[PDB]
């Protein structure tokens with residue numbers, strides 16, 4: 237990367253906000269995945285959208301790859317600079333604006349985390365529900381198409397992103413639904429917002445997200461329920477969903493995950509467990525609990541172990557399940573699977589996955605959003621090239637089993653570097669060419685986070 241180019245970057249954002257230092261680049265060359273660190277040639281912190289546009293235009297016209305960087309909590313190598321280039325850390329743009337409580341909407345810049353937003357909204361009676369375990373950038377969550385434990389009731393990022401401000405690869409500024417617009421529904425033209433949700437930084441740089449806010453629940457009850465087997469817990473899950481109980485949260489942990497979480501945080505019985513949460517009025521809760529306890533009882537579930545601070549403890553342990561797993565073998569890294577299948581096929585694949593983890597030398601824990609037909613296998617890897625090949629082969633086989641059942645290889649994490657072949661199988665030749673034609677019209681030179689997704 238030439239000295240003239242670095243000085244041009246410094247001319248846009250200021251000398252303090254450009255770094256070519258080795259350690260700074262290394263810190264921005266990886267996320268939380270096992271994908272090997274690949275340092276960008278420089279890291280740049282734009283201070284406003286004009287600077288984002290001018291950095292993008294400078295890189296694009298000079299043939300320099302651009303890697304958008306939020307909080308670096310992704311798990312598929314999205315920020316890995318496989319072709320070098322300029323990593324654009326967006327987190328100094330950290331303002332909440334256009335809070336419209338009467339309309340249930342707000343605009344956030346990339347440095348705003350869900351934590352920061354919900355802190356800002358305390359006493360408003362509103363909250364933002366999409367809750368990945370990590371303290372992630374909300375714009376990063378829009379970029380990956382994130383979901384979380386609350387999604388079964390309150391929707392994913394795709395459900396809750398109403399508008400996006402995007403700096404396109406050559407620097408042009410796009411407001412996907414129109415500048416300043418926010419509304420409940422539209423048929424006006426082609427929906428551009430949904431194209432950029434889940435684009436992972438390969439179609440442009442998200443510099444603000446307009447989010448749907450939700451009313452805080454009238455009352456909240458959380459509980460855990462222990463089961464004799466994986467089959468019993470997942471059958472209960474499917475039957476709760478088919479009974480249309482509007483559960484707020486329904487999270488599965490197998491016995492391995494439960495023990496890991498116990499050890500890293502809880503003293504739940506070591507068993508396949510559902511973490512449950514219900515929202516409503518006092519009477520609406522009693523109805524929901526009654527119908528849900530009946531279904532769990534039919535499948536051998538324990539009487540509910542009930543959970544303010546205790547509920548926060550419960551969900552904090554769930555949100556840290558990734559780190560609880562890693563702690564089973566210190567020094568190791570991890571790869572998460574993320575398949576999502578038609579709910580009626582969830583019992584087969586989860587039970588089969590549990591059986592396949594037992595039959596192998598791999599250490600794996602199972603956790604996730606079974607209310608969506610989605611789950612994660614957290615596979616530990618010693619950074620033992622043979623173990624890492626066995627983990628990667630396990631992940632691909634599980635992905636292909638999900639595709640065989642009519643499902644998808646990723647419910648929320650994305651494709652990044654890890655699932656590019658699975659995506660080709662998932663949508664076929666015409667799906668791939670169509671996605672690539674979309675990529676090519678927005679990023680003709682292929683400089684917008686190259687090597688990812690497609």
Ligand SMILES: Cc1cc2nc3c(=O)[nH]c(=O)nc-3n(C[C@H](O)[C@H](O)[C@H](O)COP(=O)(O)OP(=O)(O)OC[C@H]3O[C@@H](n4cnc5c(N)ncnc54)[C@H](O)[C@@H]3O)c2cc1C
Pocket residue numbers: 267268303304305306307308309310311313314315326346367368369370372373375376377378379380381382383384385436437438440441442443555556558559648649685688
């Ligand atoms: C402990 C833990 C728990 C997690 N739990 C969940 C979970 O429940 N659900 C879930 O969906 N994910 C989960 N994640 C994954 C991760 O938190 C999400 O994928 C999150 O959305 C990533 O945001 P980020 O800004 O940290 O991403 P980064 O790693 O910074 O970037 C991710 C990708 O998006 C691109 N990108 C980032 N910001 C922008 C932007 N502003 N514009 C354009 N492209 C951008 C990057 O180029 C990259 O390809 C978890 C991660 C951890 C470590």
Ligand SMILES: CC[C@H](C)C(=O)C(=O)O
Pocket residue numbers: 311368369554555556557558572603604612614
């Ligand atoms: C980082 C992957 C993790 C297992 C996750 O997505 C979750 O906590 O639901």
Ligand SMILES: [Mn+2]
Pocket residue numbers: 383384604605612648
């Ligand atoms: Mn998850």
